Design a protein around this nucleic acid. Sequence first.
RNA 1: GUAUGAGUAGCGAAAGACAGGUGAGAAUCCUGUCCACCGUAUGACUAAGGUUUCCUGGGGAAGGCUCGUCCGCCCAGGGUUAGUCGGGACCUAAGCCGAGGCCGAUAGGCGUAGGCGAUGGACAACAGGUUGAUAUUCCUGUACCAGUUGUUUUUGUUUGAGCAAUGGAGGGACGCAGUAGGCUAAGGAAUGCAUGCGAUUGGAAGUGCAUGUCCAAGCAAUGAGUCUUGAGUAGAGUUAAAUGCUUUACUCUUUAAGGACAAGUUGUGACGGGGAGCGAAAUAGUAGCGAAGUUCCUGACGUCACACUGCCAAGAAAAGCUUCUAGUGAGAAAACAACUGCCCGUACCGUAAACCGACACAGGUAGUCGAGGAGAGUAUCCUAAGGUGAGCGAGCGAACUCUCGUUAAGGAACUCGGCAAAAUGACCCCGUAACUUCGGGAGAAGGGGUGCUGACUUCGGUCAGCCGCAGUGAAUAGGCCCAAGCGACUGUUUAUCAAAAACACAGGUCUCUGCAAAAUCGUAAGAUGAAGUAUAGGGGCUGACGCCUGCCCGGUGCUGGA
Lengths: 44, 89, 275
Amino acid sequence: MKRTYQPNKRKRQKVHGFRKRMSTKNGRRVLASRRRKGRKVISA
Amino acid sequence: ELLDVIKRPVITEKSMLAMDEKKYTFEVDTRANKTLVKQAVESAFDVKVANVNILNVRPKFKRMGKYAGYTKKRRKAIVTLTEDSKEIQ
Amino acid sequence: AIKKYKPTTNGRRNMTSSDFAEITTSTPEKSLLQPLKNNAGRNNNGRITVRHQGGGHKRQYRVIDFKRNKDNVAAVVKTIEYDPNRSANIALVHYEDGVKAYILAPKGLEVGMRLVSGPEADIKVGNALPLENIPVGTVIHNIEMKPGKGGQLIRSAGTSAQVLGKEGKYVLIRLNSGEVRMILATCRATIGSVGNEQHELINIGKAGRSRWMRKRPTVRGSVMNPNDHPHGGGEGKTPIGRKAPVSPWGQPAIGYKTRNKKAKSDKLIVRRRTK
RNA sequence: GUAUGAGUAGCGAAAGACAGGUGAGAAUCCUGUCCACCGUAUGACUAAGGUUUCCUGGGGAAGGCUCGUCCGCCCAGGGUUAGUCGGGACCUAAGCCGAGGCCGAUAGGCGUAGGCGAUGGACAACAGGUUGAUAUUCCUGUACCAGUUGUUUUUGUUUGAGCAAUGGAGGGACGCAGUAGGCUAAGGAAUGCAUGCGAUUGGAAGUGCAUGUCCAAGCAAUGAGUCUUGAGUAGAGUUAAAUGCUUUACUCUUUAAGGACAAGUUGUGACGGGGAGCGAAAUAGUAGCGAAGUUCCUGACGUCACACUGCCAAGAAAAGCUUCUAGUGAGAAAACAACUGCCCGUACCGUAAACCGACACAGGUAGUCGAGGAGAGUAUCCUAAGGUGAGCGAGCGAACUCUCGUUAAGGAACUCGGCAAAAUGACCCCGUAACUUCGGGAGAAGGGGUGCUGACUUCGGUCAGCCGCAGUGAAUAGGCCCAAGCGACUGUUUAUCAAAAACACAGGUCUCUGCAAAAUCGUAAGAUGAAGUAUAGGGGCUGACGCCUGCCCGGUGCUGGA
């Protein structure tokens, strides 16, 4: 029947976005951790 | 900077057709409204109105050595004249 | 009165419903409506607080008058109506100045009346007096609590409240549910009991109708699993093993009182009798 | 890294054959012919989602469940045009952010004013042609919205010019169900057109075959029809004003008149375009040239239009818009002419080989259109426009397993259990029990007719005759009865071993709670209960309906006591 990963464009940028991760005190921990590891795509 | 809007002309099998109705094709640098290109052409070539057209383009790929890389964006400019010619190409 | 549908199909056997045999029109006033929402029992946090809510038809709120302050200008009633929010009908009124608003519907009001609500009106159904000049023995309603707040006491259909006797301060009253108290003598009230009187005599009949009004099914207690309600568990049909039958968080349900022992009203309450 | 199993299992549903091309090489590529499959879809358009897969010319190392000159693959070049279409430079719903602010060990929590937010509101373009790919975008023709200049017609910013609020208002403005009426579309059958006359017995035809059988927006005229009573008088009020608006009290008015709305129709638009076919000079059916536009029948939940009647479960907000005054405040209307109009999306696939499932997967995917014969019908059988022949085959015709067809005599002897199969099944007509909450059981049971031809048809059908073993001749299309337990019923339940006698359920009963109500989320502010107020709101047990519901307060809780 119906499987999970039904993809959209708005939702994937209003959940895992950037501004939605520069709008907290925890999102910044996430970002800085992704920058320490030396990652390319900090956040989708 | 009202001289580096227009970059260069497009020379294609299609464009060559539009040369037979006074319609020319240039590559216009991004971030430029229509009216700007109007002004630029009128002030660089002694020509006139008959509103321009404009476009946008996506990039593509290429594969050389496990190296996947895009190419630049574009912006065509398809211009129409009323009375004069461009014996410049 | 009350219809009695003829039994055609089982989910129609013994339903009952009003006639709506006094409601005049079916088109509300425009400048008295206000929107609403169906909170389905949820906070700003977004959790259930009270169970069994939400999920029915739509409603739009009607701004009823509750203070009755315009005095010394005659008020004319023109139409009764239906209201989905309260359990009692509503009347629309025109004042001579050219303003509109609503009123609750006392048991006996009719189109064409004229109403006044000053400190020196006459005592007939519909008028809204201050609590002092209402003589002994009458049956009044929309009683206030704090002078200027509006009505917050008896408000729903088929309800009564006598006035036992005045004092120098304050006025006594026999509320409905048969308990006496006293409230400041400078509160507003209107006379006569509320309207639709058989609205308790309606056997709904189906389960989809009590779901039209925004109710919701409410599982028994003794069916749930032990980790989710103190009664539950037990393999088979089980009796309440624990003493003092319980609610799902403590607080035995039968016999236990729940006033606030240091309330700020026991000075004003005489003979809590029926709770 | 390489063995064994082993050259084994598999090659992922559906019909192909021949001739000629092409080429080192051919069942698998191209072309042709016949055949065959779907056709409320295997057909046409769109929203997501994918992200160059689109087109042109080359290639065959790897992917393609085999082959491959071929490809959604590799290489090279090239394609996506907007004042009018969807969104922004307009309005707001759920929700979120929230200057000040109220709380909190830090972090931070919550919220006013103000904002953000389409799934909704409101708003100016139509038809045809053009390419290898784009087309309400390019081209032709005919329009529309809002502005700017130039010659083309009324002056105290008082406002008799005009304009004109962030204020006063009107409006925008809203459910479900059921039939009835009016149009256009679509469909069907005979008129007009151009063409040719059968090589199998027969046939120049009122009555013979094949084939086509028309056209906008805007503008002008009208209009099936639909909705609505209207006028004066003396008053209140509308934070200041109002000639705008509400409203009271009274006198006339009612099939009327006035107002508001309206699908559609006729001309024009149009010497334009389209069209069966005819059709070159060559690489072209190409360039180019073309008939006619009738009558009658059936006719839409598409449209008038949520228009009307009925019901209770009582059915969004704000801007755009129209007015009135307060009002800063030369002289703006309308001639016509000519000009200006910003950014973002536009290729392609899109019941799929291009999306979601690791796959070129027998699964899933919201919306519009969706034809003919019978036929109530989007059911079923064959078919139109249109598309497909599915990515391994050639032989033989054993056991055995799967999917189907038929059977003598017996007809539940099998078996845990008639599980599985068999049997009934459409329309019309006659007729139908116990029992009952009087509604039902009831399609109870059990029976009869159906084809074709002619005559009469009052209208439905009736008579006469003909043939077969069988006449809804194929596909679609209830097996029934007699008793018991459980559960009242329609529903809901363990995605992926249980769908019930389980839960829900309408009714019953006890109990709490007088409003800053009890109760719950949170440390608190704050919230829900509720814009509710005991005929209300929470908690516990029982579960339609009928008749009922005995004894015990010593023990344990609860309430009252002093």
